[PDB]
Amino acid sequence: MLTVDLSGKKALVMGVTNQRSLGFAIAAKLKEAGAEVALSYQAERLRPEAEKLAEALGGALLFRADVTQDEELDALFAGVKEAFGGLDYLVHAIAFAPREAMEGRYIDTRRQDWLLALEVSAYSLVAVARRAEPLLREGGGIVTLTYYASEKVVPKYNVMAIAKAALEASVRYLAYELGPKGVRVNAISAGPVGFTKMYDRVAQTAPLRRNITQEEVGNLGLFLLSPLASGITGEVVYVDAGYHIMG
Amino acid sequence: MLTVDLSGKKALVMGVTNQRSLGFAIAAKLKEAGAEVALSYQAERLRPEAEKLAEALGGALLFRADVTQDEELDALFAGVKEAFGGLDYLVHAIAFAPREAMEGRYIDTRRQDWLLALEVSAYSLVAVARRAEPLLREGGGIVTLTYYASEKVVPKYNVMAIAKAALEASVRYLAYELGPKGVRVNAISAGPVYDRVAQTAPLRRNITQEEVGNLGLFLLSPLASGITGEVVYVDAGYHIMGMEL
Amino acid sequence: MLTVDLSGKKALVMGVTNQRSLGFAIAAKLKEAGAEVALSYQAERLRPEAEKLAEALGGALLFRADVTQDEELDALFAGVKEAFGGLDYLVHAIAFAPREAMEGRYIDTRRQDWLLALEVSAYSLVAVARRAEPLLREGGGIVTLTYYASEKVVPKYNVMAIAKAALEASVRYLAYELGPKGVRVNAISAGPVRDRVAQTAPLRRNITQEEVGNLGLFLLSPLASGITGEVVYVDAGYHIMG
Amino acid sequence: MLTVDLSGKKALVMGVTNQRSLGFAIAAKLKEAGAEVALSYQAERLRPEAEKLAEALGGALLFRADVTQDEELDALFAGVKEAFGGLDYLVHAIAFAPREAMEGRYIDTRRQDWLLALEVSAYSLVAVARRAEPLLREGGGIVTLTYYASEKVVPKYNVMAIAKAALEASVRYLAYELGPKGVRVNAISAGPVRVAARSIPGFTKMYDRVAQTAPLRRNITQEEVGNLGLFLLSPLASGITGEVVYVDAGYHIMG
Ligand SMILES: NC(=O)c1ccc[n+]([C@@H]2O[C@H](COP(=O)([O-])OP(=O)(O)OC[C@H]3O[C@@H](n4cnc5c(N)ncnc54)[C@H](OP(=O)(O)O)[C@@H]3O)[C@@H](O)[C@H]2O)c1
């Protein structure tokens, strides 16, 4: 039997709200593999739930960070530096678009909403990669989360599709720029885990004839960060039961 | 002979600042085909440059609009409506990133530089598309410009590559949303208009401005009435190559 | 008014068996632009059909050649050389897969059926390109037809999808090899030509034969002189849909 | 600590001729994970080479089959059925194009060379997939090997690129057809690695290019391909099918 041993590795998972978050799933697997994981929550409303997740992970370090606030991000990676010394893995599981933009048509998207959506969902990767760069060790890695709508039109995904398009292009450039220093950057294109019409259609259309699970996304995230994927960087890997290959 | 007759057609061309731009080349070809063109220019300090461009096209309407200002875009489309009644073609050749963002690494892009680059280079297509929608007639079309760096890493392209990726995805969604009313949306992926391209490209040369112009013309013309949501490459085949030669 | 003047240009159109085909549409447009066209036909039992097509084009040269027979392909290109002196355009509209391969699952395709489908549908492009190369003049071009099943799974397309994937990769490599001599190679990815496609596509309709014709004409014309190694979609936007 | 326990799992590995192949690397990793492997070999003249491979894997079943011969593939899968009862994994590492096709230009490929390259390199996947289907258990998988030349022009790769393009499309369609029975199909797009690579005259200019151009500034190793093969076949990748995954040190993302 092969073992994935991440003892002594340090992990920061940003973007956690519930136990059903894809970010948590990756964290669960990372802790299971022996890593020290820290979580970061958006605002004070979610601290209680964040503490419950830390408990489920058998204990975890917590930070509050809003990705729109450069000051808060500065504080986060200062707290990480003090608490971990270095960093191995960074999970980027953050996305947002104003509700007003996620309804109706993409063409009707309002200026301030469009930018907010691109700021949180795409720029935040650049923001956190810059701050993690001097902390990241050899074999280190950043992984983000995206969706098929970046390449093909999925109605009602609107500006988020565009954000993901910007996210994935970011992944490639960051992979190119952090590669020399032994850091890998990849994206997980998850299937669904406005929504239910997409969820019940993947099940029917996808080759596996079902939806993917939260654990299946976790497993991919674990692998990509693990030394088992040491030759893999700049990739967008799909865990979607084969949906995206269907015409 | 087959003829492309675009007389009676009305076109709005945005983002053209010089005659050696790809946006100008498209405008030129539309004018050659018989269409009436209106140029937009960013600010009144650029009016003399805009007037030279109008003259070089053999006559063109001018309108002032900064694409980060919604009010001015409303004004421009009101002026286009009054002057033309409707619209057939919109050429989006606006591309900008702050100088600091383009110098150094992508990972070092500052927050507001990054947002501005995306605002001017990607969101502007959405902003003009929404305002053009009520003016656009059946068989009408929107065309924009993009580059290969959206899909593959081209160093020193930084945030523009990201903006272009956002732009191409915008083209797809706009093609879906504007399609039912007979409006097509497409992107032209132009090669550079440099030393390594000519050596690597299948054609063993760089493309010309006129070659981009011809594709722009084609895509907007009724000859391309089945084509929408596409990114079409005019790069002498360069992007199909897996190696530098 | 911009004009596309293709007078004095010589074209070879292969794979056309009926007037409602996409290959015919391109030929019609080439003829309309002023070019001389030569049609190929598979066997002598099909000459009556081939003559009808020539007449529909308002006159065209005919040559017999089966694309699985190298000897006949040599003869056809010798005939084309004799009759035209050189060649400007080659339209590859050949597509075939045995009926047994297209019925049932792709995984059940028989060896000889699978090979035959790829021979007629993909290798034929290589075979006719090699023979056209010495005839092709500067600014000359080759264009072929493909479908979106090459990239995405369209059930019941089976081995044709694979053939098209093989075809499109061939297009890229041929573009690279024939490029230095001023020859461009491109593919047209057509949507179907008439019900559900009409419901999903951005334009809310299917494409027409003429729309494929127009793209074919454009790609071969000097207006597309900077475009090579491409797969261009005429599908009313359909393939962009998730 | 997360463990990948593949004991009790049965694997068929096809197209392995040397220990320095990518197919061998996958087989080794499957063996390390606890699976039992059966190696196929083309002809009986190659039995000594096959035995050395079996020993290097720490023991493996051997079966003779030429993938262009439908009768022999029937025989091999009958033999695998008798010896294993069922199957979990199939590794497709078969790749061949005649020497004349790989020398010169793609446009000069002869008819029968072209067809043979496609027969051995692409159709063989369909052939073995059909026969593996009734043997394959839930959670089972097929993995094959491909490369970047399928999507972009890599000179001197010729018909192999076309075959790889035909192979990847096959992977998609096979993933759709074998999916309902819980079988996944995927392809590994490996960067250049220094035996089967020797039959490709455009490999080395690319090998030197990758180390300078790739984001990681090095070539990948055989073990890195092995690890991905193991991952894709393991239950850890149970949501992944119809995919082409790149292990190329990031090379193919570069413009
Ligand atoms: N779930 C799916 O069906 C699916 C499918 C494909 C891809 N994905 C991607 O997977 C990633 C994880 O999302 P999820 O679906 O698992 O849901 P999720 O974790 O509950 O939501 C994403 C996280 O981002 C956080 N966030 C939003 N704005 C933020 C800000 N300004 N500053 C800091 N954090 C912020 C959210 O906090 P708040 O809840 O407080 O806003 C939330 O914890 C997302 O990028 C998503 O696009 C999800």
Side-chain angles (χ1 to χ4, degrees), chain D residues 45-48 50-51 53-64:
Chain D
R45 31 168 272 256
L46 294 175
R47 177 88 186 189
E51 280 170 6
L53 300 172
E55 177 142 66
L57 289 169
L61 245 34
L62 294 176
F63 289 70
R64 178 185 54 84

Short mmCIF file of all heavy atoms in Angstrom, two decimals, chain D residues 45-64, unseen atoms left out:
data_model
loop_
_atom_site.label_atom_id
_atom_site.label_comp_id
_atom_site.label_asym_id
_atom_site.label_seq_id
_atom_site.Cartn_x
_atom_site.Cartn_y
_atom_site.Cartn_z
N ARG D 45 8.59 -14.47 -29.20
CA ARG D 45 10.02 -14.13 -29.28
C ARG D 45 10.43 -13.11 -28.23
O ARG D 45 11.62 -12.91 -27.99
CB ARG D 45 10.39 -13.61 -30.68
CG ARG D 45 9.26 -12.88 -31.40
CD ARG D 45 9.76 -12.14 -32.65
NE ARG D 45 10.23 -10.80 -32.34
CZ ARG D 45 9.56 -9.68 -32.61
NH1 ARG D 45 8.38 -9.73 -33.22
NH2 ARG D 45 10.07 -8.51 -32.28
N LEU D 46 9.45 -12.46 -27.60
CA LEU D 46 9.71 -11.41 -26.63
C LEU D 46 9.46 -11.87 -25.19
O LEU D 46 9.50 -11.08 -24.25
CB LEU D 46 8.87 -10.17 -26.96
CG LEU D 46 9.19 -9.44 -28.26
CD1 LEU D 46 8.19 -8.32 -28.50
CD2 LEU D 46 10.61 -8.89 -28.26
N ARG D 47 9.19 -13.17 -25.04
CA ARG D 47 8.94 -13.78 -23.74
C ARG D 47 10.06 -13.56 -22.71
O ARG D 47 9.77 -13.24 -21.56
CB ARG D 47 8.66 -15.28 -23.91
CG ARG D 47 8.45 -16.07 -22.63
CD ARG D 47 7.01 -16.03 -22.20
NE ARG D 47 6.80 -16.67 -20.91
CZ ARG D 47 5.61 -16.94 -20.39
NH1 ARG D 47 4.51 -16.62 -21.05
NH2 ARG D 47 5.51 -17.52 -19.20
N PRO D 48 11.34 -13.74 -23.12
CA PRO D 48 12.43 -13.44 -22.19
C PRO D 48 12.42 -12.00 -21.68
O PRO D 48 12.65 -11.77 -20.50
CB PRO D 48 13.69 -13.68 -23.03
CG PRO D 48 13.25 -14.63 -24.10
CD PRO D 48 11.84 -14.24 -24.41
N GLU D 49 12.14 -11.05 -22.57
CA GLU D 49 12.05 -9.65 -22.15
C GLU D 49 10.88 -9.46 -21.19
O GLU D 49 11.00 -8.74 -20.19
CB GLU D 49 11.93 -8.72 -23.36
N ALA D 50 9.77 -10.13 -21.48
CA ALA D 50 8.57 -10.04 -20.65
C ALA D 50 8.79 -10.63 -19.27
O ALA D 50 8.27 -10.13 -18.27
CB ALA D 50 7.40 -10.73 -21.34
N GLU D 51 9.57 -11.71 -19.21
CA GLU D 51 9.85 -12.37 -17.94
C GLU D 51 10.70 -11.49 -17.04
O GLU D 51 10.47 -11.42 -15.84
CB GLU D 51 10.50 -13.73 -18.16
CG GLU D 51 9.51 -14.83 -18.52
CD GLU D 51 10.18 -16.11 -18.97
OE1 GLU D 51 11.43 -16.21 -18.89
OE2 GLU D 51 9.45 -17.04 -19.40
N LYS D 52 11.67 -10.80 -17.64
CA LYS D 52 12.51 -9.85 -16.92
C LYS D 52 11.67 -8.72 -16.33
O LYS D 52 11.92 -8.28 -15.21
CB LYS D 52 13.62 -9.30 -17.82
N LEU D 53 10.67 -8.26 -17.08
CA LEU D 53 9.76 -7.22 -16.61
C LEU D 53 8.90 -7.72 -15.45
O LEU D 53 8.71 -7.00 -14.47
CB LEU D 53 8.87 -6.71 -17.74
CG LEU D 53 9.55 -6.07 -18.96
CD1 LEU D 53 8.54 -5.80 -20.06
CD2 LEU D 53 10.30 -4.80 -18.58
N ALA D 54 8.39 -8.94 -15.57
CA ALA D 54 7.60 -9.56 -14.50
C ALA D 54 8.40 -9.68 -13.21
O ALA D 54 7.89 -9.40 -12.13
CB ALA D 54 7.10 -10.93 -14.95
N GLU D 55 9.67 -10.08 -13.32
CA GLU D 55 10.55 -10.20 -12.17
C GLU D 55 10.83 -8.83 -11.54
O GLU D 55 10.87 -8.70 -10.32
CB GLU D 55 11.86 -10.91 -12.55
CG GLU D 55 12.87 -11.00 -11.40
CD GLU D 55 13.63 -12.31 -11.38
OE1 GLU D 55 14.41 -12.58 -12.32
OE2 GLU D 55 13.43 -13.09 -10.41
N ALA D 56 11.02 -7.82 -12.39
CA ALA D 56 11.29 -6.47 -11.92
C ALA D 56 10.09 -5.87 -11.19
O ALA D 56 10.24 -4.98 -10.35
CB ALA D 56 11.71 -5.58 -13.08
N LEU D 57 8.90 -6.36 -11.51
CA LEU D 57 7.69 -5.94 -10.82
C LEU D 57 7.47 -6.72 -9.54
O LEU D 57 6.51 -6.47 -8.80
CB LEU D 57 6.47 -6.09 -11.72
CG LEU D 57 6.35 -5.10 -12.88
CD1 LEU D 57 5.24 -5.53 -13.83
CD2 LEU D 57 6.11 -3.68 -12.38
N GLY D 58 8.36 -7.67 -9.27
CA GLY D 58 8.22 -8.56 -8.13
C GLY D 58 7.12 -9.57 -8.38
O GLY D 58 6.32 -9.87 -7.50
N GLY D 59 7.07 -10.08 -9.60
CA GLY D 59 6.09 -11.11 -9.95
C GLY D 59 4.94 -10.54 -10.75
O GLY D 59 4.34 -9.53 -10.36
N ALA D 60 4.62 -11.18 -11.86
CA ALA D 60 3.48 -10.79 -12.68
C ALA D 60 3.10 -11.89 -13.66
O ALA D 60 3.96 -12.56 -14.21
CB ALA D 60 3.77 -9.49 -13.42
N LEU D 61 1.80 -12.06 -13.85
CA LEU D 61 1.28 -12.96 -14.88
C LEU D 61 1.62 -12.47 -16.28
O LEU D 61 1.67 -11.27 -16.54
CB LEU D 61 -0.24 -13.05 -14.74
CG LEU D 61 -0.85 -14.40 -14.35
CD1 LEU D 61 0.03 -15.18 -13.39
CD2 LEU D 61 -2.23 -14.19 -13.77
N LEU D 62 1.85 -13.40 -17.20
CA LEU D 62 2.20 -13.04 -18.56
C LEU D 62 1.20 -13.62 -19.54
O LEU D 62 0.73 -14.74 -19.36
CB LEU D 62 3.62 -13.48 -18.90
CG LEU D 62 4.75 -12.80 -18.13
CD1 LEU D 62 6.10 -13.41 -18.48
CD2 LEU D 62 4.77 -11.30 -18.38
N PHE D 63 0.85 -12.85 -20.56
CA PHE D 63 -0.06 -13.31 -21.61
C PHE D 63 0.41 -12.80 -22.96
O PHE D 63 0.79 -11.63 -23.08
CB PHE D 63 -1.47 -12.78 -21.37
CG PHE D 63 -2.17 -13.41 -20.21
CD1 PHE D 63 -1.81 -13.18 -18.95
CD2 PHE D 63 -3.21 -14.21 -20.38
CE1 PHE D 63 -2.48 -13.78 -17.88
CE2 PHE D 63 -3.86 -14.78 -19.30
CZ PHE D 63 -3.50 -14.56 -18.07
N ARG D 64 0.37 -13.66 -23.97
CA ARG D 64 0.77 -13.25 -25.31
C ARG D 64 -0.44 -12.79 -26.10
O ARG D 64 -1.45 -13.48 -26.16
CB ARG D 64 1.49 -14.39 -26.06
CG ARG D 64 1.89 -14.02 -27.48
CD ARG D 64 2.49 -15.19 -28.25
NE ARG D 64 1.63 -16.37 -28.24
CZ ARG D 64 0.62 -16.58 -29.10
NH1 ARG D 64 0.34 -15.68 -30.04
NH2 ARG D 64 -0.10 -17.68 -29.01
#
